[PDB]
Write a protein that binds this ligand. Structure first.
Ligand code: FAD
Ligand code: DLZ
Ligand code: SF4
Ligand code: GD
Ligand code: MG
Length: 508
């Protein structure tokens, strides 16, 4: 009569569907720290540490609430290699004939649990604002998807920034106001960091010993490891940084890795925060004249729009999504991505902070590291491995669409009809990187030519047949055509030379 109740490491929510369905008197909660989940990609040590530590804390909390918990520690030699091995073990110990599980957000894990010779009753993950079945319904018959239309509908369903049947402040979307560079500022707060207690430190010591060859600096470790801490991170952001969120959303500063971003993605993704509570707090700040509407709406749109939309695309696209390669790109990831030196200031900055903090803000992920990998023709499978490995907040469901779709343009165009690529001019306008860089951003050719200046046109040229039949990009080819033929030839000869060095592993 005992049933197993699985709680995975991204399911640390009090009101998790599986827990709702359990009988604390009869059922056994099962949690397991296992090598398979620690190595399916070589996760940033900070990520591994975050999950294991939050797992232990949550297990103890489940005990405080009355559940019986069977917890398999990574450092127990009795622990098996996978979530499945531990479910089976506990079935044997217990007599249970069935496990209940909130459906995870990783296709490989889904399949593993189905393949397990123990039946699993899956429940939907209801921690999103848009239910799966409702996302599917909204998309049906649409020959083209666009996040914006989905977002407006989510605004209406939820009531967020809605004054009647009208959007707050008389228009829907304020992204046009959120695209300026930012200045250094004494009055700009730094986000809240958290010191590990002894139990987190025990996990840090474990991860250092057990996963030494993964890319990333483990210490200092500063992320929230339970709900109490995450709520403080929330409060900090709402009070101190939300009013700048809009003006500074696309900015980059060589000396500030965080600017005014919330640094909440990991907390939301593991279940420590929920999106409604986050969006509502932000809305209140507008209603009380503390945060401007471009800021609050910009913030909400990232969670209510993109986060939700991305989850939907993941769900619909299935287990073969990560095999998408619409542009036929096949190059290795350059060594600079795993920390080898590069003279490109922007990339260096981004990879360095990814190494050290397990965190890059959105515009870095999209327009620096993402943009460069696309321009250089890296296989999207390789880009996908990297983003899913290196960031504190990375799990398949949220990383895959952002990486394969939004950034690498490898899919059907569901996350943007125009690829996010640029020349160096864009990085120059939005950051202060270029003055410190050995490359010359204003040079279109020559030994000092910014590599984005070469690869941008090379990219457009090599994919002209497909992109020129694309309204939103016809202009760019017009500008290319109006240039002397010898200038074009030189640009391509030089991009080609660069690419040869890049993909040979030469420092660039
Ligand atoms: C190539 C690529 C890979 C990405 N991988 C991840 C990932 O693994 N995990 C992840 O949570 N986000 C991912 N993103 C989206 C976004 O970059 C991060 O969510 C954001 O950087 C998290 O930092 P923050 O908390 O400071 O976010 P903020 O800038 O403060 O934004 C606020 C919140 O909005 C949400 N958000 C904003 N953009 C997105 C997005 N496009 N998709 C989903 N949520 C969004 C997050 O919950 C975030 O906490 C990726 C984006 C790109 C381009
Ligand atoms: C590194 C890691 N380790 C574990 C683990 O040891 N045990 C566990 O239950 N979950 C872990 N996770 C999170 C899962 O991989 C997660 O459920 C999927 O990545 C997405 O739902 C991760 C990411
Ligand atoms: S010149 Fe080019 S490579 Fe150097 S920081 Fe600017 S955009 Fe990056
Ligand atoms: Gd492939
Ligand atoms: Mg933007």
């Amino acid at each position: 009569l005992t049933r197993l109740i699985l709680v995975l490491g991204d399911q640390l929510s009090d009101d998790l569907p599986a827990l709702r369905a359990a009988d604390p008197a009869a059922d056994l909660v099962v949690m397991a720290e296992v090598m398979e989940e620690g190595t399916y990609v070589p996760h940033h040590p900070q990520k591994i540490a975050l999950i294991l530590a939050a797992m232990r804390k949550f297990a103890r909390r489940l005990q405080e609430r009355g559940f019986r918990v069977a917890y398999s520690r990574l450092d127990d030699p009795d622990t098996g290699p996978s979530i499945g091995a531990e479910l089976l073990r506990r079935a044997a110990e217990t007599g249970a004939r069935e496990a209940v599980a909130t459906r995870p957000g990783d296709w490989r894990l889904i399949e593993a649990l189905e393949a397990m010779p123990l039946p699993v009753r899956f429940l939907p993950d209801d921690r999103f604002l848009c239910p799966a079945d409702e996302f599917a319904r909204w998309t049906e018959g649409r020959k083209q998807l666009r996040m914006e239309w989905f977002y407006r509908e989510m605004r209406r369903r939820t009531g967020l920034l809605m004054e009647g049947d009208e959007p707050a402040g008389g228009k829907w979307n304020f992204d046009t106001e959120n695209r300026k560079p930012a200045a250094p500022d004494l009055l700009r707060p730094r986000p809240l960091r958290f010191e590990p207690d002894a139990e987190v430190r025990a996990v840090l010591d474990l991860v250092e010993a057990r996963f030494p060859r993964h890319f990333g600096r483990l210490r200092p470790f500063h992320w929230a490891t339970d709900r109490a801490e995450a709520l403080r991170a929330l409060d900090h952001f709402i009070r101190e940084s939300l009013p700048r969120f809009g003006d500074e959303q696309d900015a980059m500063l060589a000396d500030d890795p965080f600017l005014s971003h919330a640094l909440l993605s990991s907390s939301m993704n593991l279940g420590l925060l929920g999106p409604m509570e986050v969006c509502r707090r932000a809305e209140t700040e507008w209603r009380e004249g503390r945060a401007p509407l471009n800021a609050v709406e910009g913030f909400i749109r990232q969670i209510l729009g993109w986060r939700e939309y991305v989850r939907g695309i993941w769900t619909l696209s299935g287990p073969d999504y990560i095999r998408s390669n619409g542009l036929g790109h096949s190059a290795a990831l350059p060594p600079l991505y795993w920390g080898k030196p590069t003279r490109m200031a922007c990339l260096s900055a981004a990879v360095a902070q990814t190494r050290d903090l397990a965190y890059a803000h959105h515009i870095q992920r999209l327009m620096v590291t993402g943009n460069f990998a696309l321009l250089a023709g890296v296989d999207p499978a390789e880009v996908h491995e990297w983003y899913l490995s290196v960031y504190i907040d990375a799990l398949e469901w949220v990383e895959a669409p952002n990486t394969i779709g939004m950034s690498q343009f490898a899919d059907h165009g569901l996350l943007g009809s125009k690829p996010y690529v640029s020349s160096g001019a864009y990085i120059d306008r939005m950051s202060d990187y270029c003055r410190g860089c050995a490359y010359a951003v204003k040079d279109r050719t020559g030994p000092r030519a910014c590599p984005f200046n070469l690869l941008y046109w090379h990219f457009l040229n090599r994919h002209r047949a497909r992109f020129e039949r694309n309204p939103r990009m016809v202009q760019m080819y017009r500008t290319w055509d109006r240039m002397e033929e010898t200038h074009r030839a030189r640009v391509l000869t030089e991009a080609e030379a660069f690419l040869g060095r890049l993909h040979a592993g030469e420092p660039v």
